[PDB]
Amino acid sequence: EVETFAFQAEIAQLMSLIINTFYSNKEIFLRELISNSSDALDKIRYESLTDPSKLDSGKELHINLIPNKQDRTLTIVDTGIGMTKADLINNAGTIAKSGTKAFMEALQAGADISMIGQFGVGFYSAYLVAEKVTVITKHNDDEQYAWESSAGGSFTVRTDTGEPMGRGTKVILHLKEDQTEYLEERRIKEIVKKHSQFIGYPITLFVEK
Amino acid sequence: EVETFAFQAEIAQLMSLIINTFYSNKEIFLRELISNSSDALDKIRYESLTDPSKLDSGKELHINLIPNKQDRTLTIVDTGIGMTKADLINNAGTIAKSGTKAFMEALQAGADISMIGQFGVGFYSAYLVAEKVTVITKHNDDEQYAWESSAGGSFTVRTDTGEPMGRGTKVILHLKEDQTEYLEERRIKEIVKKHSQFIGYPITLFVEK
Numbered sequence: 001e002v003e004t005f006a007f008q009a010e011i012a013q014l015m016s017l018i019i020n021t022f023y024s025n026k027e028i029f030l031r032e033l034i035s036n037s038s039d040a041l042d043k044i045r046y047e048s049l050t051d052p053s054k055l056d057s058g059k060e061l062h063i064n065l066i067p068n069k070q071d072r073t074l075t076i077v078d079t080g081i082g083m084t085k086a087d088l089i090n091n092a093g094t095i096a097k098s099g100t101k102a103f104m105e106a107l108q109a110g111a112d113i114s115m116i117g118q119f120g121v122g123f124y125s126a127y128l129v130a131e132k133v134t135v136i137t138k139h140n141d142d143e144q145y146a147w148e149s150s151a152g153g154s155f156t157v158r159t160d161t162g163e164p165m166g167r168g169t170k171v172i173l174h175l176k177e178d179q180t181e182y183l184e185e186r187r188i189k190e191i192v193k194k195h196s197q198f199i200g201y202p203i204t205l206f207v208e209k
Numbered sequence: 210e211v212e213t214f215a216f217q218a219e220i221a222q223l224m225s226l227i228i229n230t231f232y233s234n235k236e237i238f239l240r241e242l243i244s245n246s247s248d249a250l251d252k253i254r255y256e257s258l259t260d261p262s263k264l265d266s267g268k269e270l271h272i273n274l275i276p277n278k279q280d281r282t283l284t285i286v287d288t289g290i291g292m293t294k295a296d297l298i299n300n301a302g303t304i305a306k307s308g309t310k311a312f313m314e315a316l317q318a319g320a321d322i323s324m325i326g327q328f329g330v331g332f333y334s335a336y337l338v339a340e341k342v343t344v345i346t347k348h349n350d351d352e353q354y355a356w357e358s359s360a361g362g363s364f365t366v367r368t369d370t371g372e373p374m375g376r377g378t379k380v381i382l383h384l385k386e387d388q389t390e391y392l393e394e395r396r397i398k399e400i401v402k403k404h405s406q407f408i409g410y411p412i413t414l415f416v417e418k
């Protein structure tokens with residue numbers, strides 16, 4: 001049922017760096033996840049031009065931001081192309097090994113953490129605000145899977161028999177106790193306006209209560 | 210045999226806007242092309258994680274900048290994934306319609322031309338400095354093709370008979386007479402340092418002669 005995998009040494013080092021480096025501009029995690037969501041939506045939209053049946057799993061191409069103060073979670077949902085089990089095992093669809101190597105070299109040369117997305121490892125900026133990240137995903141060519149990691153050098157992959165999503169990716173951020181500002185409506189609106197104003201897909205910020 | 214194609218209407222409008230709008234900050238074209246090269250390199254790097262044989266066409270993942278004052282050309286070469294004939298043609302079709310339309314709307318609302326890359330049409334910033342653009346490309350699943358356009362609403366596609374490149378994309382900018390500063394070593398170095406200082410792949414600026 002649950003398979004446990006060790007992260008390669010470079011990715012584990014990047015995750016420890018993201019967690020342990022003092023860096024106040026944490027809000028960039030949201031631009032990074034929305035950017036990944038936009039890329040995944042572009043991929044399914046492209047594939048649908050030659051094969052319209054690729055949208056049988058859902059025609060709407062959108063991004064939803066779901067805060068939950070009770071669970072202390074911020075969920076980013078997209079109806080993009082999704083990820084296969086193999087993509088999840090490939091460090092949640094990243095070029096994590098070569099990307100980390102190049103990003104560490106850039107940091108040593110004076111680059112800042114906000115440039116993480118240029119190295120194909122933008123997803124890991126989620127650990128600036130989350131103690132645990134759960135990735136629920138459904139690709140047309142595979143079953144629905146749940147990827148999960150609290151860092152610490154390992155991640156798990158299991159088949160998600162739960163609520164079917166049709167197609168796409170759900171990123172569930174289990175926020176650190178001191179990062180609850182990212183659950184507030186006015187904070188999320190401010191970040192979206194600042195860093196993701198020209199995203200080519202509708203972004204819906206859900207209300208609570 | 211040369212095939213002639215019409216640009217998607219919105220791209221033809223964007224190209225005329227890029228060519229006719231007064232905009233002094235032309236140097237941003239380099240950042241956009243290097244960004245495209247970086248994305249294409251990410252794609253081949255990702256694909257090789259599951260299939261290492263995808264690097265049989267070349268293991269080195271890099272970007273080369275080649276100025277030629279004699280030919281008045283600036284060439285951007287990458288060893289990325291490359292483009293098939295279908296991609297090469299269809300990139301200028303219906304897929305680019307929304308991003309182009311959204312960019313032209315953003316411009317009407319006060320956005321500036323330098324934001325082109327946020328709309329997935331950064332390639333067309335090449336027409337800020339070039340009177341003609343030639344794109345030589347080689348994808349693992351197809352033959353080598355040459356795309357070309359001097360704008361005016363059409364582009365051509367033909368099989369390339371010149372140097373086979375193994376794998377990747379070559380963007381040849383036939384510079385406007387008044388844009389020859391982009392052939393000078395100190396100008397290219399200054400632009401790379403300013404806009405593309407921390408790319409995930411090595412950038413080599415070739416010396417002339």
Ligand SMILES: O=c1[nH]nc(-c2cc(Br)c(O)cc2O)n1-c1ccccc1F
Nearest residue numbers: 036037039040080081082083093123169
């Ligand atoms: O493809 C695909 N599918 N899905 C996906 C995702 C992921 C993530 Br981490 C997130 O957050 C979201 C999403 O949507 N994708 C991608 C994109 C971009 C990059 C890389 C990759 F993997």
Ligand SMILES: O=c1[nH]nc(-c2cc(Br)c(O)cc2O)n1-c1ccccc1F
Nearest residue numbers: 242245246248249289290291292332378
């Ligand atoms: O994929 C692929 N392959 N190749 C390519 C290219 C292009 C261009 Br325009 C340039 O300049 C460069 C390169 O390299 N690609 C891409 C990227 C980005 C975007 C879109 C697309 F198509």
